[PDB]
Amino acid sequence: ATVLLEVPFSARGDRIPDAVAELRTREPIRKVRTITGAEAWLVSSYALCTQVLEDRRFSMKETAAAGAPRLNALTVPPEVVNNMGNIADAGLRKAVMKAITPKAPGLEQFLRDTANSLLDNLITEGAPADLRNDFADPLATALHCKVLGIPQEDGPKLFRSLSIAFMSSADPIPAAKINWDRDIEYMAGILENPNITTGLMGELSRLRKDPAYSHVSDELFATIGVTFFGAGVISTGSFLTTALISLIQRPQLRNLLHEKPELIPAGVEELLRINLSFADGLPRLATADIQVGDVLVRKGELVLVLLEGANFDPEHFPNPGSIELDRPNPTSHLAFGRGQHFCPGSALGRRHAQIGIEALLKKMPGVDLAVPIDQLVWRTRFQRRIPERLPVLW
């Protein structure tokens, strides 16, 4: 006798388990056990992943319900699981989304300058360099302080909540609440700080005093700041880090992108497609009995949408494990999700990675791992897959 198949399969972000292709072929929706002991349906084909994400009866909001089967413990208050809905209900969605594009004057220049400064510091210090802690994550942090309009010097302390805030734990995490409450207090203070006039927090600070938002809560305004900083920094820093591994492990592609940087957007789209950054399937709770492939999912059951299941599905992306810069369907991957909860930061995330890679290839055309790939230490019980350090030479 064996136990019910457990998720997640592996914390390694440099290879897809061959179990994924076997599930997808044999049982593209199948029962699994999560770290909490709950049962869930793991969905691993492109067709069924899309079906689930495009049907809101598979609800994000309802995953926060008391007594539901859980992927992991909440690290935020339950109402905050519905953060985007709350933003939309407050009339703030258009303005929030506008503030977090890469489009503001000087933003791309700021990203390039920041990337180049970080790289110059690494070059001065000499190999080996840690491209996570000393490149990708500081670039993400700097970007999000700029996008939010908050002081650069405040970035590190906000950042240091993230190794706990984005845990994927069986149980509630006391430190997550300590840091959440502190970070909310910080953002509340930002909203009252007259120096903060630019970026997302500058905009929210004005809207907060406008009559059309007089009944929007102070708590929601502060929550937007904490949630968008955290989601954006963890997602961009982690994606860029693991994308850099994928790139470095493909010297021929590294060389091609170096030689023809106009190909970097197409390269980043493929790096998004093959990314293993999300450590768990995206969770949804069924609000009705719904047929998904061969399974009738019952009301109240948990469904996990495995992004690499979809993105490595050969029925949608032939030769799925290969980076091919001339695919006919390049942006149709699920790296940013799909449907109601599609990532509002997608354009910014693309730009962060494109500029980071452009800068790195120009400054370090010979970039290579400085340790055997198996020596990377993969963070466990976390909502992202990332190496603790990424040692490189050039």
By CB atoms closer than 10 A (0-12, 13-18, 19+), residue 252 is exposed
25 annotated as a binding-site residue: no
Q: Do 188 and 222 contact (CB within 8 A), yes or no?
A: yes
| 193 labeled binding residue | no
Q: What's the half-sphere exposure (Cβ side, CA atoms, 13 Å) at 263? A: 17
Q: How far apart are CA 196 and CA 59, in angstroms?
A: 36
User: Helices (H), strands (E): how many in the chain?
Assistant: 15, 10
What span, in angstroms and rounded, lies between the C-alpha atoms of 333 and 29? 19
Q: For residue 132, give the DSSP letter.
A: I
Q: Is 235 annotated as a binding residue?
A: yes
Separation between Cα atoms, residue 240 and residue 137, nearest integer Å? 8
Considering the complex, what minimum distance in angstroms separates the CB of residue 82 from ligand HEM? 8
**Cβ nearer to ligand HEM, comparing 230 with 320:** 230
Q: Which is nearer to ligand HEM, 184 or 371 (CB)?
A: 184
Q: How far is the CB of 123 from ligand HEM (least distance, A)?
A: 26
- Residue bearing tokens 């734990």: 169
Give the nearer residue to ligand HEM in terms of CB position, either 265 or 337. 337
Least Å from the CB of residue 384 to ligand HEM = 9
Angstrom CA distances, 205 to 84, 85, 220, stand at 18, 20, 12
| Residue 145 is labelled as binding a ligand | no
Q: Nearest approach, Cβ of 101 to ligand HEM (angstroms)?
A: 10
Is 383 assigned a ligand-binding role in the annotation? yes
Query: Smaller CB distance to ligand HEM: residue 36 or 393?
Result: 36
Pick between residue 281 and residue 320 the one whose CB is nearest to ligand HEM: 281
Instruction: Point out which residues bind ligand HEM (CB under 6 A).
Output: 60, 84, 100, 227-228, 231-232, 235-236, 239, 277, 282, 335-337, 341, 343-345, 348-349
83 annotated as belonging to a binding site for a ligand = yes
Residue 327 or 352: the one with the smaller Cβ distance to ligand HEM is: 352
Instruction: For residue 10, say whether it is annotated as part of any ligand binding site.
Output: no
d(CA 51, CA 243): 27
Q: Note whether 335 and 273 are within 8 A (CB).
A: yes
Q: In this structure, how many other beta carbons lie within 10 angstroms of the beta carbon of residue 379?
A: 19
- Tell me whether residue 311 is annotated as binding: no
Measured from the CB atom, the residue of 169 and 174 that comes closer to ligand HEM is 169
Query: Nearest approach, Cβ of 126 to ligand HEM (angstroms)?
Result: 30
Q: What SS3 state is found at 214?
A: coil
> Distance (Å, rounded) from C-alpha 117 to C-alpha 177?
35
Least Cβ distance, residue 218 to ligand HEM (angstroms) = 19
CB of 60 to ligand HEM, least distance (A): 6
Distance, in Å, from the CA atom of 79 to the CA atom of 61, rounded to the nearest integer, reads: 8
Residues in the annotated binding site for heme: 284, 341, 343
Per the annotation, binding residues for substrate are 75, 83-84, 235, 299, 383
Binding residues: 75, 83-84, 235, 284, 299, 341, 343, 383
